[PDB]
Design an enzyme around this catalytic site. Structure first.
Site, PDB file in Angstrom:
ATOM      1  N   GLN A  14       3.053   1.140   3.334  1.00 27.60           N
ATOM      2  CA  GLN A  14       2.691   0.127   4.306  1.00 27.60           C
ATOM      3  C   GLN A  14       3.070  -1.271   3.818  1.00 27.60           C
ATOM      4  O   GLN A  14       2.956  -1.576   2.637  1.00 27.60           O
ATOM      5  CB  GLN A  14       1.179   0.215   4.587  1.00 27.60           C
ATOM      6  CG  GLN A  14       0.641  -0.763   5.627  1.00 27.60           C
ATOM      7  CD  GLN A  14      -0.785  -0.427   6.039  1.00 27.60           C
ATOM      8  OE1 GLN A  14      -1.206   0.738   5.959  1.00 27.60           O
ATOM      9  NE2 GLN A  14      -1.548  -1.444   6.469  1.00 27.60           N
ATOM     10  N   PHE A  40       1.900  10.462   2.094  1.00 25.39           N
ATOM     11  CA  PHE A  40       1.280  10.071   3.354  1.00 25.39           C
ATOM     12  C   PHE A  40       1.993   8.853   3.958  1.00 25.39           C
ATOM     13  O   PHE A  40       2.755   9.011   4.913  1.00 25.39           O
ATOM     14  CB  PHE A  40      -0.216   9.820   3.126  1.00 25.39           C
ATOM     15  CG  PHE A  40      -0.995   9.564   4.385  1.00 25.39           C
ATOM     16  CD1 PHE A  40      -0.967  10.466   5.434  1.00 25.39           C
ATOM     17  CD2 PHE A  40      -1.786   8.427   4.506  1.00 25.39           C
ATOM     18  CE1 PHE A  40      -1.696  10.229   6.592  1.00 25.39           C
ATOM     19  CE2 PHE A  40      -2.519   8.189   5.656  1.00 25.39           C
ATOM     20  CZ  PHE A  40      -2.473   9.089   6.701  1.00 25.39           C
ATOM     21  N   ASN A  96      -3.176  -0.610  11.901  1.00 25.82           N
ATOM     22  CA  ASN A  96      -4.287  -1.230  12.629  1.00 25.82           C
ATOM     23  C   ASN A  96      -5.599  -0.884  11.942  1.00 25.82           C
ATOM     24  O   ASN A  96      -5.605  -0.034  11.064  1.00 25.82           O
ATOM     25  CB  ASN A  96      -4.302  -0.813  14.112  1.00 25.82           C
ATOM     26  CG  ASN A  96      -4.611   0.658  14.322  1.00 25.82           C
ATOM     27  OD1 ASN A  96      -5.603   1.176  13.823  1.00 25.82           O
ATOM     28  ND2 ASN A  96      -3.784   1.325  15.113  1.00 25.82           N
ATOM     29  N   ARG A 102       0.826  -1.204   0.000  1.00 20.71           N
ATOM     30  CA  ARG A 102       0.000   0.000   0.000  1.00 20.71           C
ATOM     31  C   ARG A 102       0.868   1.264   0.000  1.00 20.71           C
ATOM     32  O   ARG A 102       1.727   1.445   0.870  1.00 20.71           O
ATOM     33  CB  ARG A 102      -0.933  -0.028   1.205  1.00 20.71           C
ATOM     34  CG  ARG A 102      -1.919   1.123   1.288  1.00 20.71           C
ATOM     35  CD  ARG A 102      -2.563   1.158   2.656  1.00 20.71           C
ATOM     36  NE  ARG A 102      -3.516   2.252   2.774  1.00 20.71           N
ATOM     37  CZ  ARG A 102      -4.034   2.679   3.923  1.00 20.71           C
ATOM     38  NH1 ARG A 102      -3.698   2.111   5.081  1.00 20.71           N
ATOM     39  NH2 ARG A 102      -4.890   3.685   3.917  1.00 20.71           N
ATOM     40  N   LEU A 129      -3.047  10.898  12.786  1.00 17.26           N
ATOM     41  CA  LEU A 129      -2.855   9.558  13.331  1.00 17.26           C
ATOM     42  C   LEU A 129      -2.338   9.553  14.778  1.00 17.26           C
ATOM     43  O   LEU A 129      -2.239   8.487  15.400  1.00 17.26           O
ATOM     44  CB  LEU A 129      -1.909   8.748  12.439  1.00 17.26           C
ATOM     45  CG  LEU A 129      -2.275   8.688  10.951  1.00 17.26           C
ATOM     46  CD1 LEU A 129      -1.243   7.863  10.208  1.00 17.26           C
ATOM     47  CD2 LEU A 129      -3.682   8.140  10.716  1.00 17.26           C
ATOM     48  N   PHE A 137       3.935   0.647   8.882  1.00 15.89           N
ATOM     49  CA  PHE A 137       4.104   1.627   7.802  1.00 15.89           C
ATOM     50  C   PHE A 137       5.183   2.671   8.106  1.00 15.89           C
ATOM     51  O   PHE A 137       5.545   2.889   9.264  1.00 15.89           O
ATOM     52  CB  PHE A 137       2.771   2.281   7.399  1.00 15.89           C
ATOM     53  CG  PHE A 137       2.116   3.112   8.492  1.00 15.89           C
ATOM     54  CD1 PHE A 137       1.209   2.536   9.377  1.00 15.89           C
ATOM     55  CD2 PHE A 137       2.383   4.467   8.608  1.00 15.89           C
ATOM     56  CE1 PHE A 137       0.605   3.296  10.370  1.00 15.89           C
ATOM     57  CE2 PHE A 137       1.791   5.229   9.605  1.00 15.89           C
ATOM     58  CZ  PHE A 137       0.893   4.643  10.484  1.00 15.89           C
ATOM     59  N   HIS A 140      -2.232   5.400  16.291  1.00 19.14           N
ATOM     60  CA  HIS A 140      -1.266   4.383  15.888  1.00 19.14           C
ATOM     61  C   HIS A 140       0.016   4.448  16.722  1.00 19.14           C
ATOM     62  O   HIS A 140       0.525   5.527  17.017  1.00 19.14           O
ATOM     63  CB  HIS A 140      -0.907   4.555  14.412  1.00 19.14           C
ATOM     64  CG  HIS A 140      -2.063   4.337  13.484  1.00 19.14           C
ATOM     65  ND1 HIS A 140      -2.320   3.123  12.888  1.00 19.14           N
ATOM     66  CD2 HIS A 140      -3.033   5.179  13.058  1.00 19.14           C
ATOM     67  CE1 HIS A 140      -3.395   3.226  12.130  1.00 19.14           C
ATOM     68  NE2 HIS A 140      -3.845   4.465  12.213  1.00 19.14           N
TER      69      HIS A 140
END
Length: 173
Positions: A59, A56, A98, A51, A118, A109, A122
């Site tokens: 991952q 940003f 998560n 991903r 975040l 990530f 996270h």
């Protein structure tokens, strides 16, 4: 207004180059123990970075490559470990993926920019060294097909724990 010192170090040998990660094992002992042990079990060998959201995150850490798999060393998803001195205020940080609270497995990530939204959602457990952040950023330099998935994902080939801060990690068979 200053980041706590790190304790622990892991090298990821990736298809984008070497990525050196310094660990906040004091602040996120559960996440850091998980990460170190999974590395030593060769669990991350040949896993892709499935991903990429430009600017940003990138991952990975899913042994199935699908984006929905992966498990911690503890037999169930483990708890979040937040810390007010560890914030998503710059690129080059390493955090647990998560899909809700207390939902940490193996997926993790890297941040490609800021991710203030975040904070307190996270676990931040490490940061990439200055002399390997360009390699980390190169993981995201990929053509992205549907669903944020690269056409040719980069991969972790192997890992090296350069410094283990834990006494008592026994890799599973």
């Amino acid at each position: 207004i200053q980041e706590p010192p790190t304790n622990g170090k892991v090298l990821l040998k990736t298809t984008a180059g070497d990525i050196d990660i310094e660990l906040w094992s004091k602040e996120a002992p559960k996440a850091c123990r998980n990460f170190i042990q999974l590395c030593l079990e060769a669990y991350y060998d040949n896993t892709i970075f499935h991903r990429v959201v430009p600017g940003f995150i990138v991952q990975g850490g899913d042994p199935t490559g699908t984006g929905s798999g992966g498990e911690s060393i503890y037999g169930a998803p483990f708890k979040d470990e937040f810390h007010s001195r560890l914030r998503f205020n710059r690129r080059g940080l390493v955090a647990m993926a998560n899909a809700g609270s207390h939902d940490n497995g193996s997926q993790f990530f890297f941040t490609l920019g800021r991710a203030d939204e975040l904070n307190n959602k996270h676990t931040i457990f490490g940061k990439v060294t200055g002399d390997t952040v360009y390699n980390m950023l190169r993981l995201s330099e990929v053509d992205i097909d549907d669903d944020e998935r690269p056409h040719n994902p980069h991969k972790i080939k192997s890992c090296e724990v350069l410094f283990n801060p834990f006494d008592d990690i026994i890799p599973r068979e």
